[PDB]
C-alpha cells in the first residue's frame, strides 16, 4: 500500500489544515478597492488611516472597532484598466474619490471613469462609496466663479448646498443597476474619525445585505 | 544546522533518565525525528520515531512500553524518557532528522550522540563480509542482502547506505538505492535489484574508511544489519 | 403521529 | 522623429528574409506530424497497464 | 365511524404526500449535494432538513399501507418505523429552529459573526440536534412493540405501556416540538424584522415578506395538530365525561391535522430553498450540466 | 514625412514578397489525410486546495510535479500522480498572474501586479522554501515569465517590453522593445534560442535571445493576443486572441498558415497548448470549457467540459501523457 508514502500523505494533510486556517483567517478581512481620477484627494483619504520597493500596488492595513480593513491603491499601474480589473472581482466595496473643486473638464473625465467602473461586468453586486473631497475650495470657487462654466445646463442659483446636492445626484444617477447595487455618498470633513465611521457604516450595511443574500432570504 | 544532545551518564538499573536533543539552524516543525542507538562495539539499532506535528509515533519492539518520545516545537527540542532501564540499554544515542515528501532524502543529518551507561523485526538485512583490507588506489564493492523484496508496487526500492567514520556520527551516503545524497563525492555509486544491493567506490581516499551500513525503509521496524569495515 | 390510536 | 528612422531601419532589415514556399512548410509540418504519430498518448491512448493516471 | 374515515382518508392522502415530499426533498437534496463545496450554514441546515423530510415521507407509506386493513410487518419493523418517524419529526422541528437562530446570527450580529465566527459550529449543532432526536425517540424502541388488542384482527403498531406514560410522552412531544421552535423562531425573526426595519434598502422588503410568510406558515400549519393532541391529552384526564362520539370526532380531527402537518413538512423546501436567488442559480447551473 | 512614405513602401514590399510564396494552402494540401477520431478525454484527478481563482500553472520537466498560483497569495506544488501537496509557498503579494517551473526543478518563479519577479529556491538545507531572488525593474504588471537555463529568466510585462535577466546579479541582461501594446504572453523555442511574444496590439514578434534583436513580426489577428505556444517542431506556432480565433503561423514562410474558428464560439481564448506530436491543439475559452482542434484539418476533434468558470491556465506534459487545466473555480483537473 504505502511504505513512506503515508508520511507524505500526513504532510499533505498538515499542509491542507494550514491552508484552511490561513483561508479562514483571511476571510475575516474587509477588502476595499480605492479608485480616483488623477489622484484627486486620494492621498488625503489615505492619510486618515490609523495603525517602498514595489511601485505597482499599494497596501494599506488598518483597524476600526476591531474590524480589520485592507485598502488597495492601484493608481500607479498606468496600464490598460481591463487587463487587471478582474483580479478585484471579490472586493467588498469600491471607494471612489472625486475632487469637488474641478478647466479641461476634469469633472467630465471623473464622471466617465465613474460610469465605466460602476457598469463594469465584473463589479455587479459591488457597492461604491463616493467621497467628494475638497469642499472648502469648492465653496470658495463657487462664491467667486459660477458653476455654469462647467455646467451651462444648470437652472439654479450659486449657493453651495444646492450645487453640492446637484453634483451628488448627477453622480448617483450614473448607476444603471439601481436595484442591484447602492451608492453611499459622503462629503469629506476635517473631523478625524467621521470618514472612518462613515466607511464602517457602509461596510456594515454591505455585509448585512450580503448575508441576507447568502442566508436564503431575498 | 546542528543537533546537540544531552542527558547521558551513569544510571543504576531500574531507574529512569531523559535525553534532550536541541536543534538549531533548520525548521524543526517540518522534520520527523528518529532516536537511534549504537551499543559499544556493535551495530546501529533503531529505537523510536515521532512524526511532524506528533501525528504518528513508532517504537522498537525491544523498547516498547518503557520508552516515551516527545517533541516541543516552540523550544525546538526532542525528549526521550526512559523508565525501568535495563543492562542492555547502555549505548550511545543519536538524534536523526528525516523529512518525507516526493523526492526528499530522509536520514540526511545525524546528531552527535550521548553515552548512557547502566551500572551493574520481520525484515533482516545481512552483510556477509565484516572487514575488507583495502589499499587507497582501487575500487571496492560492498554487498547487502535482504530477506524481503524491498521493491514496492510504485517502483521505489527503499534501501539507504550510511557511512560512519571512526569517532564520528554516520552520514547518509545513498538514499533509495540509486540517488546520491547532497555533498557526497561522485565516486560513490549504488545499484541493486529487489533483494541484492551493491555500493561501489571507484577510488578510495583517507576519508573513505569506516563502517558502512545498509538500512531498509519498507516496513517500519527499520532494521539495520551489521556494517562492513574498511580500513588501511 | 400517524399512529391512528386504537383507543376504543 | 528618430523613431521613424528606427522603424524604417527595422523594416528594411526585416525585408531581407529568405522566404520558403508555403507548400514546403506545409509538407514539413505534415511530415513531422506523421513521423511522431505513434508517440502521442493523447492521439493514440495507451493501455491502462502503463498509464500513470487512473 | 373513525375506522371508516381513516380507511377513506389516510391511504390516498398519504400516497400523495409520498410522491410530493420525495419529489421536493429529492430535488433540494440533489441540488445542494452536487455542489457540496462552498456550503453556507443555512445551506447545510437546509440539506439536513431535506434529508429528514425525505426519510419521514418515505417511512410514511409503511403506515399508509398499514392503515388500510392490517399489519404483517412484525414488531421489529413497527419499532424501527415508529422511532425513525419520531426522529424525523423532531429533526424537522429542531432544524427549523436552528435555521432561525442562524439567520438571527447572520443578520443581527453581522459584524461580530463576520470577525469572530466559529468555523465548526454548524456540524456541532447538527450532530447535537440529531443526537437529541434519537434521545427523544428511544422510548419508542424500548417500550413500544406490536400489541394484540385483538377482538377481531387489527393489532398493528400501538404501544403496550400504561396511560400515564402516554400522557407524559404526548406532553413531551408537544412541549419540545412546538414550544421550542415557536419561541426560538418568534424571538429570532422579531429581532431580524426590527433590524431590517431600522435599515434602509431595496431587498429588505422581500426579506420582511419572506420572514413573515415563513413564521405564519409554520405556526398556522403546526398549530392544529398540536392543539388537538393537547386538547385530547388534557381532556381525557378529568375535563369531561368522555362520551362515545367524542372519540370518533377527535380521531378524525387528529387524522386531518396530522395530514396538514405532513403537508407543511413537504411544503418546507419550496418555501425555504426555491425562494432564494442563490439556490435557484445553483439549480440552473446544475441543470445546464445535464 | 520623408520617412513615413518609405515605411509604407517597405510594408507594401513585405506584403508583396510574402504573398508570392503563398502558392497553396495547408488545408487544400492536407484534405487527403485521414481525420483523427472523436477525442474523448476523461478526468483522472482533481486537485483541490486553492481558495481563489487559479491564474497560472506549469508542469515540471519530469511531467509528474506541477506548480499552480492562485490569487489568494499561494503557490502550491502538486505531485499529480497522488494529488499530494509537496510544497505550499505563501507569497508576499497576493496579486499574482503567472508562475513557472525551472527545467532542473530547483527553483520556481512568480509575478503579478507588484512588477517584481520572485524566484524561490526549493532545495534548501533548512528544510523550507525561501525566496532566493526578487528581480525588479519592470514598470508594469508581470504577465509571463519563463526559465531558460536555471540561471537566466525571460519575463514580459505590461510596459510593452520584455526582458532577459541574470538571477545571480538580478540585473536585466537584455531588454526587448518594439511592441506597441501590453505583452500578454511568451513561449520559448524548444532549443531556447528564439522566442515569440504576443502583445495587445494584435501582433506577435519573434525575438532572438542573443543580441536582443527582433527577427520577424506576424499580424492577422483582430484583437489582443492572450496566449501563444510554439509548435513542437520549432518551426511554427499558434496564437489565441479575444476574437475567438486561433491562428497557426510558420516561421520559415513568414505568414499565416491556418485559422481555427467556429460560429458557436464568440468568447475569447485564454490559453493555447499543443500535443506531443503537434497533431492536436488545445485551446481554453471563456465559455467554461476547452476545445481540442485538429491542427491539420481545422475541425473540432473534441470538447473538454467540467469547469464551472473561465479556464485560465492549460498545460501538456513533456511526454504528452496528460493535460492539466485550471479555471477560476479554484480547481485543477488532469485529463487523459
Ligand atoms: C431507526 C433507524 C432508521 C435509525 C435512525 C437513524 C437515521 C434515520 C439518521 C441518524 C443520523 C442521520 C444522519 C446524520 C448526518 C447526516 C449527514 C448529512 O450530510 C446527510 C444526512 C445524514 C447521513 C443523516 C441521515 C439520517 C441519519 C442516518
- Structure-derived torsion over alpha carbons of residues E78, E84, E90, E95, reported in degrees to the nearest 10: -160
From residue B84, give the alpha-carbon distance in Å to each of B13, B50, B90, E41, F267: 7, 21, 13, 53, 75
CA distance A192 to A116: 31
Using an 8 Å Cβ cutoff, are E140 and E79 in contact?
A: yes
Cβ of residue E78 lying under 6 Å from some atom of ligand 1 = no
SS3 sequence, chain A?
Answer: CCCCHHHHHHHHHHHHHHHHHHHHHHCCEEEEEEEECCCCCHHHHHCCCCCCCCCCCEEEEEEECCEEEEEEECCCCCCCHHHCHHHHCCCCEEEEEEECCCCCCHHHHHHHHHHHHHCCCCCCCCEEEEEEECHHHHHHHHHHCCHHHCCCCCCCCCCHHHHHHHHHHHHHCCCCCCCCCCEEEEECCCCCCHHHHHHHHHHHHHHHHHHHHHCCCC
Q: Any idea what the CATH number is for the domain that residue A165 is in? A: 3.40.50.300
Residues of chain A positioned with their CB less than 8 A from the CB of F79: 8
Q: How does DSSP classify residue E207? A: H
Q: Which domains does chain B have, with CATH numbers?
A: 3-118 (2.60.40.10), 125-230 (2.60.40.10)
Angle at CA B23, nearest 5°, toward B223 and B33? 25
- Give which of A74, A58, A72, A66 is closest to A28, Cα–Cα: A66
Using an 8 Å Cβ cutoff, are F111 and F152 in contact?
A: no
Question: CA of B103, closest CA in chain F: separation in Å?
Answer: 9
Atom of ligand 1 nearest to the CA of E44: 19
For residue A134, the enclosing domain spans 26-211
Q: How far apart are the first and last CA of chain D?
A: 62
CA distance E289 to A126: 28
- Give which of E35, E46, E175 is closest to E102, Cα–Cα: E46
CA distance A190 to F248: 61
Query: Mapping DSSP to helix (H, G, I), strand (E, B) and coil, where does residue F38 land?
Result: coil
Cβ of residue E215 lying under 6 Å from some atom of ligand 1 = no
- Give which of D3, E261, B104 is closest to F123, Cα–Cα: B104
CA distance E57 to E267: 12
Each domain of chain D, given as residue ranges in start order, spans 1-53
Residues of chain C positioned with their CB less than 8 A from the CB of E255: 4
Cβ of residue E83 lying under 6 Å from some atom of ligand 1 = yes
Q: Which CATH class is domain F4-335?
A: mainly beta
Of all protein residues, the one whose alpha carbon is nearest to atom 8 of ligand 1 is E84
Q: How does DSSP classify residue F144? A: E
Given the C-alpha cell 422510548, which residue does it identify?
E139
Helix/strand/coil percent split, chain F, to 5: 5, 50, 45
Given the C-alpha cell 531500574, which residue does it identify?
B14
Q: In which element (H, E) is residue F281 found?
A: strand F280-285
As given in the structure block, the three cell numbers for residue B175 are 538514499
Q: How does DSSP classify residue E179? A: I
List all chains that touch chain B, counting a touch as 3 or more CB pairs closer than 8 Å.
Answer: A, F
Q: In which element (H, E) is residue F45 found?
A: strand F43-47
As given in the structure block, the three cell numbers for residue E78 are 413497527
Query: Left, alpha or beta for F203 (phi > 0: left; psi -120 to 50: alpha)?
Result: beta
CA distance F234 to F195: 10
Q: Residue F235, exposed/middle/buried by CB under 10 A (0-12, 13-18, 19+)?
A: middle
D23 → chain F, closest CA residue: F24
CA distance E229 to F132: 76
Cβ of residue E56 lying under 6 Å from some atom of ligand 1 = no
Using an 8 Å Cβ cutoff, are A193 and A57 in contact?
A: no
For this PDB entry, the determination method is: cryo-EM
Domain D1-53 indexed as CATH 4.10.260.10: yes
> Phi and psi dihedrals of F335, rounded to 5?
-120, 140
Cβ of residue E55 lying under 6 Å from some atom of ligand 1 = yes
**Helices of type H across E65-120:** 74-107, 110-116
CA distance B206 to B163: 14
Using an 8 Å Cβ cutoff, are E178 and E92 in contact?
A: no
Given the C-alpha cell 501538456, which residue does it identify?
F316
Q: How far apart are the first and last CA of chain F?
A: 58
Of all protein residues, the one whose alpha carbon is nearest to atom 2 of ligand 1 is E84
Residue D36: CA count within 13 A, CB half-sphere:
18
Q: How does DSSP classify residue E273? A: T
E196 → chain A, closest CA residue: A208
Q: How does DSSP classify residue D37? A: G
Of all protein residues, the one whose alpha carbon is nearest to atom 16 of ligand 1 is E48
CA distance A108 to A102: 9
CA distance B225 to D54: 38
Each domain of chain E, given as residue ranges in start order, spans 2-289
- Give which of F99, F105, F100, F64 is closest to F322, Cα–Cα: F64
CA distance F317 to F119: 22
Residue of B25, B101, B107, B183 to mutate when probing chain F, most F C-beta within 10 A? B101
- Give which of F112, F159, F107, E110 is closest to A78, Cα–Cα: F159
Q: Helix A160-172 to helix A135-144 angle, to the nearest 10 degrees?
A: 120
Using an 8 Å Cβ cutoff, are B5 and B35 in contact?
A: no
Using an 8 Å Cβ cutoff, are F47 and F68 in contact?
A: yes
Residue of F10, F80, F204 to mutate when probing chain D, most D C-beta within 10 A? F10
Q: Residue E115, exposed/middle/buried by CB under 10 A (0-12, 13-18, 19+)?
A: middle
SS3 sequence, E109-154?
Answer: CHHHHHHHCCCCHHHHHHHHHHHHHHHHHHHHHHHCCCCCCCCCCC
From residue A125, give the alpha-carbon distance in Å to each of A175, B135, B167, F249: 12, 81, 72, 42
CA distance B29 to B26: 9
Residues of chain B positioned with their CB less than 8 A from the CB of F87: 101
Using an 8 Å Cβ cutoff, are A205 and A92 in contact?
A: no
A6 → chain B, closest CA residue: B100
Using an 8 Å Cβ cutoff, are B120 and B32 in contact?
A: no
Q: Given E40, E199, E206, which is nearest A205 (Cβ)?
A: E199
Cβ of residue E84 lying under 6 Å from some atom of ligand 1 = yes
The residue length of chain A stands at 218
Task: Check the CA dihedral F165-F166-F169-F173 and report its sign.
Answer: negative
Using an 8 Å Cβ cutoff, are A182 and E242 in contact?
A: no
From residue E203, give the alpha-carbon distance in Å to each of A177, A178, A180, A213, D31: 14, 12, 9, 9, 64
Q: Given F86, F123, F127, which is nearest B31 (Cβ)?
A: F127
- Structure-derived torsion over alpha carbons of residues F13, F16, F20, F21, reported in degrees to the nearest 10: 70
Per CATH, the number for E2-289 is 1.20.1070.10
Q: How many domains does chain A have?
A: 1
* Touching, C vs B (3+ Cβ pairs under 8 A): no
Query: Mapping DSSP to helix (H, G, I), strand (E, B) and coil, where does residue F114 land?
Result: coil
User: DSSP secondary structure string, chain B?
Assistant: -EEEEE--EEE-TT-EEEEEEEEESS-GGG-EEEEEEE-TTS-EEEEEEE-TTS--EEE-GGGTTTEEEEEETTTTEEEEEEES--TT--EEEEEEEE--STT--TT--B---EEEEE------EE----EEE--TTS-EEEEEEESS--B-TTS-B-EEEEEE-TTS--EEEEETTTEEPTT--TTEEEEEETTEEEEEESS--TTS-EEEEEEE-SSTT------EEEE-
Distance of CA B25 to the CA centre of its chain: 21
Of all protein residues, the one whose alpha carbon is nearest to atom 20 of ligand 1 is E48
Given the C-alpha cell 419508542, which residue does it identify?
E140
CA distance B126 to F168: 48
- Which is it for strands B114-118 and B125-126: parallel, antiparallel or unpaired? unpaired
Residue numbers after which chain C is interrupted (C to N above 2.5 A) read: none
Using an 8 Å Cβ cutoff, are F184 and F198 in contact?
A: yes
Q: How far apart are the first and last CA of chain E?
A: 51
CA distance F156 to F163: 6
Each domain of chain F, given as residue ranges in start order, spans 4-335
Atom of ligand 1 nearest to the CA of E52: 26
Amino acid at each position: 500500500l504505502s511504505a513512506e508514502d503515508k508520511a507524505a500523505v500526513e504532510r499533505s494533510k498538515m499542509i491542507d489544515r494550514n491552508l484552511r486556517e490561513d483561508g479562514e483567517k483571511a476571510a475575516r478581512e474587509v477588502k476595499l478597492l480605492l479608485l480616483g481620477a488623477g489622484e484627486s484627494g486620494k492621498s488625503t483619504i489615505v492619510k486618515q488611516m490609523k495603525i517602498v520597493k514595489t511601485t505597482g500596488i499599494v497596501e494599506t492595513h488598518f483597524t476600526f472597532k476591531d474590524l480589520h480593513f485592507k485598502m488597495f491603491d492601484v493608481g500607479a499601474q498606468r496600464s490598460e484598466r481591463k487587463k487587471w480589473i478582474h483580479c478585484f472581482e471579490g472586493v467588498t466595496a469600491i471607494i471612489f474619490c472625486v475632487a469637488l473643486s474641478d478647466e479641461m473638464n476634469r469633472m467630465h473625465e471623473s464622471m466617465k471613469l465613474f460610469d465605466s467602473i460602476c457598469n463594469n461586468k465584473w463589479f455587479t453586486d459591488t457597492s461604491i462609496i463616493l467621497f467628494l473631497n475638497k469642499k472648502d475650495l469648492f465653496e470658495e470657487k463657487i462664491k467667486k466663479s459660477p458653476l455654469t462654466i462647467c455646467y451651462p445646463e444648470y437652472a439654479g442659483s450659486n449657493t453651495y448646498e444646492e450645487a453640492a446636492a446637484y453634483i451628488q445626484c448627477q453622480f448617483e444617477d450614473l448607476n444603471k443597476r439601481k436595484d442591484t447595487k447602492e451608492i453611499y455618498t459622503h462629503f469629506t470633513c476635517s473631523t478625524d474619525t467621521k470618514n472612518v465611521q462613515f466607511v464602517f457604516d457602509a461596510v456594515t450595511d454591505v455585509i448585512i445585505k450580503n448575508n441576507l443574500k447568502d442566508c436564503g432570504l431575498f | 544546522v546542528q543537533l546537540v544532545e544531552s542527558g547521558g551518564g551513569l544510571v543504576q538499573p531500574g531507574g529512569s533518565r531523559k535525553l534532550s536533543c536541541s536543534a538549531s539552524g533548520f525548521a524543526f516543525s517540518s522534520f520527523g525525528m528518529h532516536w537511534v542507538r549504537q551499543a559499544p562495539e556493535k551495530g546501529l539499532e533503531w529505537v523510536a520515531y515521532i512524526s511532524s506535528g506528533s501525528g504518528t509515533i513508532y517504537y522498537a519492539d525491544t523498547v516498547k512500553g518503557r520508552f516515551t518520545i516527545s517533541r516541543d516545537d516552540p523550544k525546538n527540542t526532542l525528549f526521550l524518557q526512559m523508565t525501568s532501564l535495563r543492562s542492555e540499554d547502555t549505548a550511545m544515542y543519536y538524534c536523526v532528522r528525516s523529512i518525507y515528501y516526493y523526492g526528499s532524502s530522509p536520514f540526511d543529518f545525524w546528531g552527535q550522540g550521548t553515552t548512557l551507561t547502566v551500572s551493574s523485526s520481520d525484515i533482516v538485512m545481512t552483510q556477509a563480509t565484516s572487514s575488507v583490507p583495502v589499499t587507497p588506489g582501487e575500487s571496492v564493492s560492498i554487498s547487502c542482502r535482504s530477506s524481503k523484496s524491498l521493491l514496492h508496487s510504485n517502483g521505489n526500492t527503499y534501501l539507504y547506505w550510511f557511512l560512519q567514520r571512526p569517532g564520528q556520527s554516520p552520514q547518509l551516503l545513498i538514499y533509495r538505492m540509486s540517488n546520491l545524497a547532497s555533498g557526497v563525492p561522485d565516486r560513490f555509486s549504488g545499484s541493486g535489484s529487489g533483494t541484492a544491493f551493491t555500493l561501489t567506490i571507484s577510488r578510495l581516499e583517507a576519508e573513505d574508511v569506516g563502517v558502512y551500513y545498509c538500512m531498509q525503509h519498507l516496513e517500519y521496524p527499520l532494521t539495520f544489519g551489521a556494517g562492513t569495515k574498511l580500513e588501511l | 403521529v400517524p399512529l391512528s390510536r386504537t383507543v376504543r | 522623429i528618430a523613431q521613424a528612422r528606427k522603424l524604417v531601419e527595422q523594416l528594411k532589415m526585416e525585408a531581407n528574409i529568405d522566404r520558403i514556399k508555403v507548400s514546403k512548410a506545409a509538407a514539413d509540418l505534415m511530415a513531422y506530424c506523421e513521423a511522431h504519430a505513434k508517440e502521442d498518448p493523447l492521439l493514440t491512448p495507451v493501455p491502462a497497464s502503463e498509464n500513470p493516471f487512473r | 365511524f373513525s375506522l371508516n374515515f381513516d380507511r377513506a382518508f389516510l391511504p390516498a392522502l398519504y400516497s400523495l404526500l409520498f410522491l410530493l415530499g420525495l419529489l421536493g426533498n429529492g430535488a433540494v437534496a440533489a441540488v445542494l449535494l452536487s455542489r457540496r463545496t462552498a456550503l453556507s450554514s443555512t445551506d447545510t441546515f437546509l440539506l439536513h432538513l431535506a434529508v429528514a423530510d425525505t426519510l419521514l415521507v418515505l417511512t410514511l407509506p409503511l403506515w399508509a399501507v398499514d392503515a388500510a386493513v392490517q399489519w404483517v410487518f412484525g414488531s421489529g419493523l413497527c419499532k424501527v418505523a415508529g422511532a425513525l418517524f419520531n426522529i424525523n419529526f423532531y429533526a424537522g422541528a429542531l432544524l427549523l429552529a436552528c435555521i432561525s437562530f442562524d439567520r438571527y446570527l447572520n443578520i443581527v450580529h453581522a459584524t461580530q459573526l463576520y470577525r469572530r465566527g466559529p468555523p465548526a459550529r454548524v456540524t456541532l449543532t447538527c450532530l447535537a440536534v440529531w443526537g437529541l432526536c434519537l434521545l427523544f425517540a428511544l422510548p419508542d424502541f424500548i417500550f413500544l412493540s406490536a400489541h394484540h388488542d385483538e377482538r377481531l384482527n387489527a393489532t398493528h403498531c400501538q404501544y403496550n405501556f400504561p396511560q400515564v406514560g402516554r400522557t407524559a410522552l404526548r406532553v413531551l412531544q408537544l412541549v419540545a416540538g412546538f414550544l421550542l421552535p415557536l419561541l426560538v423562531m418568534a424571538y429570532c425573526y422579531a429581532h431580524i424584522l426590527a433590524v431590517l426595519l431600522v435599515s434602509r434598502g431595496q431587498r429588505r422588503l422581500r426579506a420582511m415578506r419572506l420572514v413573515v410568510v415563513v413564521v405564519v406558515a409554520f405556526a398556522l400549519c403546526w398549530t392544529p395538530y398540536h392543539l388537538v393532541v393537547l386538547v385530547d391529552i388534557l381532556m381525557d384526564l378529568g375535563a369531561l365525561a368522555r362520551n362515545c362520539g367524542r372519540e370518533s370526532r377527535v380521531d378524525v380531527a387528529k387524522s386531518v391535522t396530522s395530514g396538514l402537518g405532513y403537508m407543511h413538512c413537504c411544503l418546507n423546501p419550496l418555501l425555504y430553498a426555491f425562494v432564494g436567488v442563490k439556490f435557484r442559480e445553483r439549480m440552473w447551473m446544475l441543470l445546464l450540466r445535464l | 514625412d520623408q520617412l513615413r512614405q518609405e515605411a509604407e513602401q517597405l510594408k507594401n514590399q513585405i506584403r508583396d514578397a510574402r504573398k508570392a510564396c503563398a502558392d497553396a494552402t495547408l488545408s487544400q494540401i492536407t484534405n487527403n489525410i485521414d481525420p483523427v477520431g472523436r477525442i474523448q478525454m476523461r478526468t483522472r484527478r482533481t486537485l483541490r486546495g486553492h481558495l481563489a481563482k487559479i491564474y497560472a500553472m506549469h508542469w515540471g520537466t519530469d511531467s509528474r510535479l506541477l506548480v499552480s498560483a492562485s490569487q489568494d497569495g499561494k503557490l502550491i506544488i502538486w505531485d499529480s500522480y497522488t494529488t499530494n501537496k509537496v510544497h505550499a509557498i505563501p507569497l508576499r503579494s497576493s496579486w499574482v498572474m503567472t508562475c513557472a517551473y525551472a527545467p532542473s526543478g530547483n527553483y520556481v518563479a512568480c509575478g503579478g501586479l507588484d512588477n517584481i519577479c520572485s524566484i524561490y529556491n526549493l532545495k534548501t538545507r533548512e528544510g523550507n522554501v525561501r525566496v532566493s531572488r526578487e528581480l525588479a525593474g519592470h514598470t508594469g504588471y508581470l504577465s509571463c515569465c519563463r526559465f531558460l537555463d536555471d540561471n537566466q529568466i525571460v519575463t514580459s510585462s505590461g510596459d510593452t517590453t520584455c526582458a532577459l535577466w541574470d538571477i545571480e546579479t538580478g540585473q536585466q541582461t537584455t531588454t526587448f522593445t518594439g511592441h506597441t501594446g501590453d505583452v500578454m504572453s511568451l513561449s520559448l523555442a524548444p532549443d531556447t534560442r528564439l522566442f515569440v511574444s504576443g502583445a495587445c496590439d494584435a501582433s506577435a514578434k519573434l525575438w532572438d535571445v542573443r543580441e536582443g534583436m527582433c527577427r520577424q513580426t506576424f499580424t492577422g489577428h483582430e484583437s489582443d493576443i492572450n496566449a501563444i505556444c510554439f509548435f513542437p517542431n520549432g518551426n511554427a506556432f499558434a496564437t489565441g486572441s479575444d476574437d475567438a480565433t486561433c491562428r497557426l503561423f510558420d516561421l520559415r514562410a513568414d505568414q499565416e498558415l491556418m485559422t481555427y474558428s467556429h460560429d458557436n464560439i464568440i468568447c475569447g481564448i485564454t490559453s493555447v497548448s499543443f500535443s506531443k506530436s503537434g497533431r492536436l491543439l488545445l485551446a481554453g475559452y471563456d465559455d467554461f470549457n476547452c476545445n481540442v482542434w485538429d491542427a491539420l484539418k481545422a475541425d473540432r476533434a473534441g470538447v473538454l467540459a467540467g469547469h464551472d468558470n473561465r479556464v485560465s491556465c492549460l498545460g501538456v506534459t513533456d511526454d504528452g501523457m496528460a493535460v492539466a487545466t485550471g479555471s477560476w473555480d479554484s480547481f485543477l483537473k488532469i485529463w487523459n
